[PDB]
Design a protein around this ligand. Structure first.
Ligand SMILES: O=C(O)c1ccc(C(=O)NCCO)cc1
Ligand SMILES: [Ca+2]
Length: 558
């Protein structure tokens, strides 16, 4: 009977707890001792851990499906509920201590939140079909698609909040959600489709048009193929051979040559991203090291990009169009984090998406033959298109930009919703969310090759147009030099949760968000802190003091 006790915890297992979904099966209800801090994680307080599943069933593919959850409820509780977002194609159940992203030591459980996580409705250990491209195989089941898109996060939010009410005898005062990439998509989905589920939302590098990522992948694959060298085991050009690491570093150094000082300070960071896009063209830019053109006049040298390379990358970066010339996704910003050198190690965080590792005999780019290309085929194309894994790269090379893009909007047979219907989160109708007090912090690294930061910026402009005064409840924080969710030559680490709570609960909007670099070696310094600035502002050096110190910077126009 006593609230927030071992006894209250074990009583959750099964029968006096009423779950919102009748098909909820608790498998674990265990009391956990406080855990000390480690070098990489903050101390976790004493808490109840509950795990189990919702809606166990058999899919039309004959496979088992269920929505797994793990919930942790501290004995000493700050009254707040927290859910972390997913990543990739989901399918795994995390420790559910409430990750807050941004490379942070603290978890939400370490801050005395009750924390929940889900696997999204499928299980990479079970829903792994060798004939349906592996752990993307859940896409063969219509309901599993719906669970991946929106239904799992809905079910698990409701289950968590009911358990919180039972365990503590009181409903959560506020609820918070934090996710990056696929978890960023989840957060935008929540603000649009379930506006009262969460009071504060952080959505980092959000895949809010994830079904179009494969379209961009086909495009970047085909755009880069002319500059490839060699073929793989099934005759596909080695896209990874199109640019060596030194070649990409050359390109980022040219970008810096053109763009670094456009914010007023030569420091290896392009804060003025808009001015950079208007000024930089690989075909007209100079290599700063030797005042010559970046594009070769003669044969290929180490200080030089070949004409086909420059053409390939310009076309990749422009984004896909169909035969009518219609943009299918968006363009991508030139930025210094496409490469970067720290010590003797070249940044791999940009090139792994479209190119893959140079020192390989096979293709391995996420968008050529990796999980992104596989996920489009099975998860987002309706009629799913399962095939052997060795055919995926060829399928991207043969992708038809008039025919195939239609498949993310199509229904067929028992696939009664399109992948844009269930996975997309493109709505700018956030009024219900704003008007109950909701706040949303978006962020995106500029050298993200999974999702275009410019496309997030375009969503935010549309939001601002649809909802005048939107900066009162939603702000976007672009991070120069940052790659996908983390890494790269930028200030990629930050505590988003503290400003989010301040906004929701005190009405204190973030006019800036402190950040620091996880690899300050990209700049040859020991540390670098900078403000992140709300769109469309950028960080501006005040003219004196340490260039690596955030206090000497302010947020302003470019
Ligand atoms: O299908 C894709 O293209 C794609 C899907 C999910 C992610 C993601 O969530 N990344 C997590 C890394 O933090 C990235 C790309
Ligand atoms: Ca600069």
């Amino acid at each position: 009977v006593p609230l927030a006790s071992r006894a209250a915890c074990e009583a959750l297992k099964d029968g006096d707890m009423v779950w919102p979904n009748a098909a909820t099966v608790v498998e674990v209800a265990a009391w956990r001792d406080a855990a000390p801090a480690t070098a990489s994680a903050a101390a976790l307080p004493e808490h109840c851990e509950v795990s189990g599943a919702i809606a166990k069933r058999t899919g039309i593919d004959g496979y088992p499906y269920e929505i797994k959850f793990r919930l942790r409820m501290p004995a000493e509780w700050n009254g707040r509920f927290f859910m972390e977002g997913g990543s990739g194609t989901n399918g795994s159940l995390s420790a559910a201590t409430g990750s807050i992203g941004g490379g942070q030591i603290a978890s939400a459980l370490s801050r005395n939140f009750a924390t929940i996580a889900t696997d999204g409705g499928h299980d990479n250990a079970v829903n792994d079909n060798p004939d349906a491209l592996g752990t993307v195989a859940f896409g063969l089941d219509p309901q599993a698609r719906l669970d991946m898109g929106y239904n799992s996060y809905d079910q698990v939010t409701q289950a968590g909040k009911a358990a919180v009410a039972r365990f503590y005898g009181r409903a959560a005062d506020k609820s918070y959600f934090i996710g990056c990439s696929e978890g960023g998509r989840e957060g935008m989905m929540l603000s649009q489709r379930f506006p009262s589920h969460y009071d504060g939302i952080v959505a980092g590098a959000p895949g809010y048009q994830l079904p179009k990522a494969g379209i961009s992948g086909a495009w970047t694959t085909q755009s880069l193929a002319p500059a490839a060298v060699g073929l793989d085991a099934q005759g596909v050009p080695l896209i990874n051979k199109s640019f060596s690491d030194a070649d990409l570093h050359l390109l980022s150094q040219a970008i810096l040559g053109t763009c670094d000082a456009l914010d007023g300070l030569a420091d290896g960071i392009v804060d003025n991203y808009r001015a950079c896009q208007a000024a930089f063209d690989p075909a007209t830019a100079a290599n700063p090291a030797n005042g010559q053109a970046l594009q070769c006049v003669g044969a290929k040298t180490a200080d030089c990009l070949s004409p086909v390379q420059v053409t390939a990358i310009k076309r990749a970066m422009a984004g896909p169009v169909n035969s009518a010339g219609t943009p299918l996704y968006n363009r991508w910003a030139w930025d210094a984090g496409m490469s970067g050198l720290s010590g003797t190690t070249y940044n791999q965080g940009w090139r792994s998406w479209w190119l893959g590792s140079f020192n390989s005999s096979a293709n391995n780019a996420q968008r050529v033959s990796g999980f992104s290309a596989r996920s489009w085929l099975v998860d987002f194309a309706t009629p799913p298109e399962p095939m052997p894994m060795t055919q995926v790269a060829a399928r991207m090379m043969k992708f038809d930009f008039d025919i195939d893009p239609l498949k993310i909007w199509a229904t067929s047979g028992q696939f009664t919703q399109s992948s844009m219907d269930w996975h997309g989160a493109t709505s700018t109708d956030l009024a219900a969310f704003r008007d109950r007090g909701g706040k949303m912090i978006l962020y995106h690294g500029m050298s993200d090759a999974a999702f275009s930061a410019l496309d997030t910026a375009d969503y935010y402009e549309r939001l601002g147009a649809a909802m005048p005064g939107a900066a009162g409840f939603a702000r976007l924080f672009l991070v120069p030099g940052m790659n996908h969710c983390s890494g790269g030559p930028g200030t990629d680490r930050f505590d988003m949760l503290t400003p989010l709570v301040a906004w929701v609960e005190r009405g204190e909007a973030p006019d800036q968000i402190s950040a620091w670099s996880g690899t300050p070696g990209y700049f040859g310094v020991a540390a670098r802190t900078r403000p992140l600035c709300p769109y469309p502002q950028i960080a501006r050096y005040k003219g004196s003091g340490d260039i690596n110190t955030e206090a000497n910077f302010a947020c302003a126009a470019p």
